[PDB]
Design a protein around this ligand. Structure first.
Ligand SMILES: *[C@@H]1O[C@H](CO)[C@@H](O[C@@H]2O[C@H](CO)[C@@H](O[C@@H]3O[C@H](CO[C@H]4O[C@H](CO)[C@@H](O)[C@H](O)[C@@H]4O)[C@@H](O)[C@H](O)[C@@H]3O)[C@H](O)[C@H]2NC(C)=O)[C@H](O)[C@H]1NC(C)=O
Ligand SMILES: *[C@@H]1O[C@H](CO)[C@@H](O[C@@H]2O[C@H](CO)[C@@H](O[C@@H]3O[C@H](CO)[C@@H](O)[C@H](O)[C@@H]3O)[C@H](O)[C@H]2NC(C)=O)[C@H](O)[C@H]1NC(C)=O
Ligand SMILES: *[C@@H]1O[C@H](CO)[C@@H](O[C@@H]2O[C@H](CO)[C@@H](O[C@@H]3O[C@H](CO)[C@@H](O)[C@H](O)[C@@H]3O)[C@H](O)[C@H]2NC(C)=O)[C@H](O)[C@H]1NC(C)=O
Ligand SMILES: *[C@@H]1O[C@H](CO)[C@@H](O[C@@H]2O[C@H](CO)[C@@H](O[C@@H]3O[C@H](CO)[C@@H](O)[C@H](O)[C@@H]3O)[C@H](O)[C@H]2NC(C)=O)[C@H](O)[C@H]1NC(C)=O
Ligand SMILES: CCCC[C@](C)(CO)Nc1nc(N)nc2cc(F)cnc12
Ligand SMILES: CCCC[C@](C)(CO)Nc1nc(N)nc2cc(F)cnc12
Ligand SMILES: CC(=O)N[C@@H]1[C@@H](O)[C@H](O)[C@@H](CO)O[C@H]1O
Ligand SMILES: CC(=O)N[C@@H]1[C@@H](O)[C@H](O)[C@@H](CO)O[C@H]1O
Ligand SMILES: CC(=O)N[C@@H]1[C@@H](O)[C@H](O)[C@@H](CO)O[C@H]1O
Ligand SMILES: *[C@@H]1O[C@H](CO)[C@@H](O)[C@H](O)[C@H]1NC(C)=O
Ligand SMILES: *[C@@H]1O[C@H](CO)[C@@H](O)[C@H](O)[C@H]1NC(C)=O
Ligand SMILES: *[C@@H]1O[C@H](CO)[C@@H](O)[C@H](O)[C@H]1NC(C)=O
Ligand SMILES: *[C@@H]1O[C@H](CO)[C@@H](O)[C@H](O)[C@H]1NC(C)=O
Ligand SMILES: *[C@@H]1O[C@H](CO)[C@@H](O)[C@H](O)[C@H]1NC(C)=O
Ligand SMILES: *[C@@H]1O[C@H](CO)[C@@H](O)[C@H](O)[C@H]1NC(C)=O
Ligand SMILES: OC[C@H]1O[C@H](O)[C@@H](O)[C@@H](O)[C@@H]1O
Ligand SMILES: OC[C@H]1O[C@H](O)[C@@H](O)[C@@H](O)[C@@H]1O
Ligand SMILES: OC[C@H]1O[C@H](O)[C@@H](O)[C@@H](O)[C@@H]1O
Ligand SMILES: OC[C@H]1O[C@H](O)[C@@H](O)[C@@H](O)[C@@H]1O
Lengths: 743, 751
């Protein structure tokens, strides 16, 4: 049958549905139940009375804008393995939890007391998350950890107590632990006893203890006098399995090399937001990490200091397994070749990260002297022409890839974005490696590209030129990049805005391998001499955020064939072009090779459906966010349409038998359908419709809805998502309830 | 006595009825019988007949433009029942012909943007009182049209015609037999290749002649452009303007002129404005004998005369330019040249009244700024949109070849000499960028991608700037002495400088605001401010208006952080504060109580507020305007009168208020303007309509509410009847939503 209120694929997706109590209509065979972001206020032993096969329960953020849990409310669920109770304003750990629990997360509550009565019986616990309960300027209490409360959990592998006021590492920790998170715990001193027996530990996070608070984007409290964290010389002597060490924001001025004497597997060392400029120049500890792969030393700048060069110790040459060196926020003016000599013979160093250093000039000749550089990240510098925090993410840096993977996959990547290379000189890219991926976005480049600017790096396959002010006055622009496959020219509207200047786009045709071209948000409304775009290779063209409403206006025919010359085109995005109307000849001149057409977010008051006959490969047609009022009677016009997106229009009536042929996905949500008559379901053929979206329609829940209700019951192969949002607008006794909950 | 469907206003004892854009299908017969001016524009009216305007005889002007909205059938003599109509507006109506039977009373008739290709004598020659006749934009561009047939001598009868505009129709020749009463003649884009002597021989009182767009310059045209055979110039004879002694405006833009006959201007010594845009006059600008024949010329526009494919080192200005002693503004856009030296503008430096020089869109790379000091009195130096580096889609009522907007915003130019360097690439300001400059009072450095750390010495050479535009840059605020050398600075615009503000790891210092004694207006909008360094408060004993829209007060006033709780309190003189577009889901009670008590205007619109602590208004005794539009407010307070004695305007549109609290229109007798439009009000019952008191409530907006139009409405309906002093705008949109018998229907339309 059709599940309600949840969607059961056995997991029951039942989140964000404005539920006020645990639904009693959940299938008795569900394995995992996700009830997050609902308005649930109480949990008793009757709430999950019929779901004894439950292993995972998600009750995060309830009620959405506290959660009362009775003692033993979960006790009857003897298969409950994972219980997520985040953002519930819980004042205590819930009493009488099932001993079958292996993962429990109480992140972001008001729990200031970790008691034996609450935790010391869940001896099967492997992951325990208690982070973010008392932090910053929250009015809260210092965390009380009963002596030996974790001593019972002999199978505990992960313990997270970060962002609580602990002041001391808890004693009597089980030696089964592999990951210990103690970030922002006000722990000023690490004794020799604190981790004496954790011989299985692979991760240790002591970040944010005695923090560096200058320019902190959060309420920050330094240790007395901004002193360093006090780590005993033998505090790590038995952590021989450690792979991850996070010492970010611990006010370190000196790194004791003896910390790593017995740490042969250390792979990632985080040292952000310290005062390690002197250690970077000396680096006695660097001798001890020949297996280290990632070293983050970012934001160690000295306040008010803008040195001429970066001082990299020669001992960086001992990091023989280094693959990624992160040196953001060191702040220096010039990168000379000899400054990076200690790094030039590392065999696996493929990522160098020098973002946000206010570097004025770089001798790009030095990057060729490297063994295996794959990612050169120089974004956000000063190079000139030649609750607030996600508790489940990294706190001191974003974890997204430095360069988009679609660009980095082509080969070596150079990122010069967010600088002020406002024009490319003739020798800007001399003595560089064979760059395949180049990011020059947001440089305010206003120059006329002619066909020589990228001659020194002619093998670029993916070129990012977004957010500039490029001046297209040469038909030979970018033609020296004959192997170019992806070109991004989004947000270059500066000169396209001005009618009096020339706009030449003819260079598009001089490419044999160009596949992806993005001209979005350029305000294109006039072109010079050649009015048509032409390419025999181009596969995808993104033309959103332009003025096709002007290019195709009724008193102008020069642009009637603007896209016809894109003979290989399969994907075309015409969204956000302010189109109230598409001339029939202009639509008929779109490439017949199209398989995907987006005309969403315009102002289309009418769509000529019969013209679809000239597009036998059209699988996807996107017309969401328009003002369409009518559908065609005999959709005779296509045998290829698999997806029809029509949400946010003004359709008030559905044609007879519309629910067609190869249509598998039909989106009619957010329209003006009051009902779906029996005429629309009087289909001859057997339907292949697998998803039909109808939420947001002002359905009239009288007796006339019964014919469509039975159609739903007959076709359970047609998945109707968000049935809780397919809501009756009429009559008053049904306004607010789902159409599936009537007589 | 409340009007419907039109809004009947009053203007110097005249009666206007504003009835535009109301989805009307027929001309309403409920207008007042005293109305003199009726605006029925932008409706869905399809027919105009004998009976469409019965009994409305003081009617002097009618606006039927844009009908129907997204043709208009006018029957013969549908107006002649009138006796006083002087102005008839019939624009954009798809009329196939000039309507027949229009009254002899017409002094102005506008037929712009129709399908009229036949100017017959039946239609126009009977209207002896016509002063202005508009027929432009009927066959133009690639529109499927017909050539304009002008019946010979049809304008011969209108001996009172002062304005005739036939622009953007295919005329081929200047119409013969024009009445000598003509003072303005528009023949733009009319495919008139030749101007003979008989063409304007009899119009001795003409003050403007528009011949633009004939034999046009078609390169880079933003419209379908058809040049004369071989790109030839327009052919105007030597004596074509000999009898035009009263001409003050001459438009010859886009006529592909290569040479100008100086004798054309011999007998027009009063010519004030000469438009020569979009031609090929680079040679005439350097030689130019005609420049000696314009002694009273005040405005000379030579823009976009560039030679295609040419990028000369310097601009070549004839020394005969010094003969333009009455010149006030020189527009030299689109000349395209690399360098501006002081020797190149010597012919201009002795003109007494030259105040505006416009050099935009020239791709100038270097300018010797010392040349502007030698000018007698330059007030506007427009150098926007160049390449300086560190040292229907056309409005038928606007100019077709340039925008008529002021070059500098008037609020800036009012302070004195203005220098516009916007839209260049001055990405940092060197120690001598502004040396040898005049006493600049108004400086526009916007959109230069400037990433400099201002530190107090960048503007020393021009220390009397009162209005500084630094918008759309990437400024780096790491110095507390930034801009402090501009001691007289009164307006500082720092909009759209979010580049470094969004990076949490770099510093953001805003302490320099306090060092100004005369700063009145500060705009920090759309900067994404959410973290500051060291000092968390904005302080100024002079600041009057702070625009803080488009920032992140939702993060700054986060519940787990109190550092920014008094961010605005140190603005002791602040009277206007804009906190819109800050994604606020709630304001902490202590945060609102720390807003400056001197506030009279507070904007918190377009956020996400679901609750508002109305009690806190007790601490703002001068608050006159509270703008809470575009939020998610669910309730109103029982006790607004107990919380404020000063609030005059309360804007609450686009919220979720479904109930009006009892006694909401009495008691509060400082409130003149209450906006409850686009809310969730289903009814307003008698209890909220109590009036104890004085009630200064004058305006009450309610359109967009889903009104329950049963008999419960009846009491609010009769509250409207008994309170005509309360204007309720747009009754057409105060619409019943239920039941279906009255849906889509205005609430005054009911028994
Ligand atoms: C100090 O440095 C530490 C070492 O880098 C940081 O630790 C990391 O912390 C983040 C933030 O929570 C963790 O990220 C999460 O990991 C979980 C679990 O991931 C695993 O399992 C899933 C499927 O079960 C799998 O897909 C993943 O790839 C993992 O194998 C994710 O569910 C979250 O979405 C999020 O990614 C890291 O896992 C953790 N690193 C390690 C090695 O455990 C620590 O955050 C730093 N301290 C601060 C204050 O930032
Ligand atoms: C300019 O237009 C291009 C072409 O569409 C944009 O690039 C593309 O961005 C989409 C995301 O909208 C990428 O699709 C995705 O790939 C990921 C990773 O495999 C996948 O998980 C997603 O489901 C989705 O399929 C697409 O790969 C990417 N194409 C290329 C060649 O990079 C680009 O983002 C636009 N630029 C701007 C500034 O908007
Ligand atoms: C400093 O230079 C900048 C760059 O030219 C000036 O900005 C421009 O300002 C004008 C006037 O506000 C904008 O024009 C208008 O657009 C609005 C909305 O589209 C419209 O309602 C008005 O009728 C007018 O047409 C123009 O778009 C804008 N351009 C850019 C690129 O920002 C700025 O005004 C100058 N500052 C001073 C004090 O003069
Ligand atoms: C940055 O914020 C300032 C301060 O509000 C903005 O300036 C002001 O813009 C308003 C219009 O939004 C001007 O108001 C108007 O003045 C005209 C002319 O008198 C009047 O006809 C209107 O009814 C309205 O009252 C105001 O004068 C002006 N103030 C100043 C000192 O220039 C500015 O536009 C904002 N900048 C950006 C880029 O948003
Ligand atoms: C105002 C339009 C100039 C038209 C013309 C002559 C075309 O060649 N010139 C230039 N057009 C463009 N688009 N950019 C340039 C940049 C320069 F630095 C110099 N000249 C040009
Ligand atoms: C990573 C932020 C460094 C913070 C610190 C040391 C503040 O003094 N430095 C600079 N901060 C800012 N905001 N801008 C600059 C620009 C420069 F050219 C040089 N240094 C700075
Ligand atoms: C109409 C006008 O403004 N004329 C001015 C005049 O007032 C002024 O005295 C002279 C300066 O020499 O410049 C000219
Ligand atoms: C950083 C700061 O607070 N103030 C500095 C000041 O010390 C310096 O002399 C000046 C010129 O560079 O720039 C500013
Ligand atoms: C101390 C101070 O500067 N007070 C100012 C005053 O000078 C100014 O006249 C007024 C209105 O602008 O705003 C306040
Ligand atoms: C490190 O680089 C060398 C090249 O000298 C290569 O042989 C080796 O496989 C690399 N190591 C890893 C782990 O990729
Ligand atoms: C280029 O840099 C910009 C700015 O950092 C970034 O938004 C964009 O994703 C980058 N592009 C690629 C392909 O990495
Ligand atoms: C393109 O630029 C090159 C180099 O500046 C130039 O030689 C060529 O003429 C240009 N092509 C044009 C303007 O069509
Ligand atoms: C058409 O697109 C396909 C898919 O990328 C590509 O393989 C083919 O080469 C393109 N056609 C031409 C002529 O380049
Ligand atoms: C749809 O396009 C066809 C052209 O094939 C045309 O004949 C038809 O009139 C169009 N329909 C509408 C409603 O304009
Ligand atoms: C409004 O703020 C005051 C603080 O003066 C507080 O006492 C009151 O409870 C607040 N009201 C609401 C509804 O939060
Ligand atoms: O929330 C941070 C992180 O948490 C975990 C996963 O859900 C990830 O996809 C997500 O990015
Ligand atoms: O991340 C997986 C995703 O990567 C990218 C593309 O290759 C997609 O086709 C793929 O699904
Ligand atoms: O439309 C251009 C111009 O026409 C006239 C007046 O309505 C002006 O206000 C307007 O700017
Ligand atoms: O131009 C009139 C207008 O100009 C500006 C401001 O001074 C306004 O107060 C004024 O109404």
């Amino acid at each position: 049958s059709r599940s309600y209120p949840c969607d059961e694929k056995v997991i029951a997706e039942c989140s964000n549905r404005r539920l006020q109590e645990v639904p009693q209509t959940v299938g008795k065979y569900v394995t995992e139940l996700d009830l997050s972001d609902n308005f649930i206020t109480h949990i008793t032993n009757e709430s999950f009375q019929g779901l004894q096969n439950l292993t995972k329960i998600n009750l995060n953020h309830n009620p959405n804008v506290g959660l009362n849990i009775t003692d033993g409310a979960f006790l009857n669920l003897k298969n409950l393995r994972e219980l997520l109770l985040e953002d519930n304003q819980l004042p205590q750990i819930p009493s009488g939890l099932p001993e079958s629990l292996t993962e429990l997360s109480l992140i972001q509550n008001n729990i200031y007391n970790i008691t034996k009565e609450g935790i010391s019986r869940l001896i099967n616990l492997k992951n325990l998350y208690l982070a973010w309960n008392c932090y910053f300027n929250k009015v809260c209490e210092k965390t009380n950890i009963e002596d030996g409360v974790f001593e019972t959990l002999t199978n505990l592998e992960l313990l997270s107590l970060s962002f609580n006021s602990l002041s001391h590492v808890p004693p009597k920790l089980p030696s089964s632990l592999r990951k210990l998170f103690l970030s922002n715990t006000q722990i000023k001193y690490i004794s020799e006893e604190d981790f004496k027996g954790l011989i299985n530990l692979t991760l240790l996070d002591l970040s944010g203890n005695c923090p560096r608070c200058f320019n902190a984007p959060f309420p920050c409290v330094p240790c007395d006098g901004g002193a360093s964290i006090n780590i005993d010389r033998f505090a790590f002597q038995n952590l021989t399995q450690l792979r991850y060490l996070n010492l970010s924001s611990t006010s370190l001025r000196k790194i004791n090399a003896a910390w790593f004497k017995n740490m042969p597997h250390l792979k990632v060392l985080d040292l952000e937001f310290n005062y390690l400029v002197g250690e970077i120049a000396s680096g006695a500890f660097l001798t001890m990490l020949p297996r280290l792969e990632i070293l983050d030393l970012s934001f160690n700048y000295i306040k008010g200091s803008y040195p001429q060069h970066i001082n990299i110790s020669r001992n960086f040459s001992k990091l023989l397994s280094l693959r990624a060196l992160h040196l953001r926020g060191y702040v220096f003016q010039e990168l000379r070749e000899d400054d990076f000599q200690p790094l030039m013979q590392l065999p696996n160093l493929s990522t160098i990260n020098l973002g946000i250093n206010f570097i004025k000039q770089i001798d790009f000749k030095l990057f060729q002297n490297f063994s295996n550089l794959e990612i050169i990240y120089l974004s956000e510098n000063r190079i000139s022409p030649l609750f607030e925090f996600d508790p489940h993410s990294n706190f001191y840096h974003f974890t997204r890839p430095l360069i988009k993977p679609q660009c980095a996959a082509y080969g070596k990547a150079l990122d010069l974005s967010l600088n002020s290379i406002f024009f490319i000189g003739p020798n800007q890219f001399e003595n560089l490696p064979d760059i395949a991926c180049l990011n020059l976005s947001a440089n305010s480049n206003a120059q006329v590209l002619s066909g020589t600017e990228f001659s020194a790096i002619p093998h670029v396959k993916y070129l990012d030129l977004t957010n500039n002010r490029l001046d297209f006055d040469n038909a030979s622009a970018l033609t020296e990049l004959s192997d170019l496959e992806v070109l991004d020219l989004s947000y270059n509207s500066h000169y396209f805005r001005i009618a009096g200047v020339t706009h030449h786009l003819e260079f598009i045709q001089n490419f044999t391998n160009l596949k992806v071209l993005n001209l979005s948000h350029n305000n294109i409304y006039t072109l010079t001499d050649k009015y048509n775009l032409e390419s025999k290779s181009l596969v995808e063209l993104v033309f959103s955020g332009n003025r096709l409403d002007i290019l195709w206006n009724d008193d102008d025919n020069r642009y009637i064939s603007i896209f016809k010359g894109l003979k290989n085109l399969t994907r075309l995005d015409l969204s956000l072009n302010r189109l109230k109307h598409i001339p029939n000849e202009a639509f008929l001149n779109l490439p017949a090779s199209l398989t995907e057409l987006h005309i969403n977010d315009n102002m289309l008051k009418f769509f000529n459906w019969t013209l679809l006959q000239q597009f036998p490969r059209l699988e996807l047609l996107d017309l969401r966010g328009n003002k369409l009022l009518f559908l065609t009677d005999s959709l005779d016009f296509t045998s290829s349409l698999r997806t029809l997106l029509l949400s946010h229009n003004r359709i008030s009536h559905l044609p007879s038998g519309f629910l067609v042929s190869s249509l598998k996905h039909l989106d009619l949500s957010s329209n003006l359908l009051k009902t779906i008559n029996k005429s629309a379901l009087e289909t001859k053929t057997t339907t292949k419709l697998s998803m039909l979206e109808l939420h947001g329609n002002p359905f009239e829940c009288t007796c006339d809805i019964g014919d469509f209700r039975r159609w739903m019951d007959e076709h359970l192969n047609v998945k109707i998502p968000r049935l809780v949002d397919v809501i009756c607008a009429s009559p008053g006794d049904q306004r607010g309830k789902s159409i599936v909950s009537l007589e």
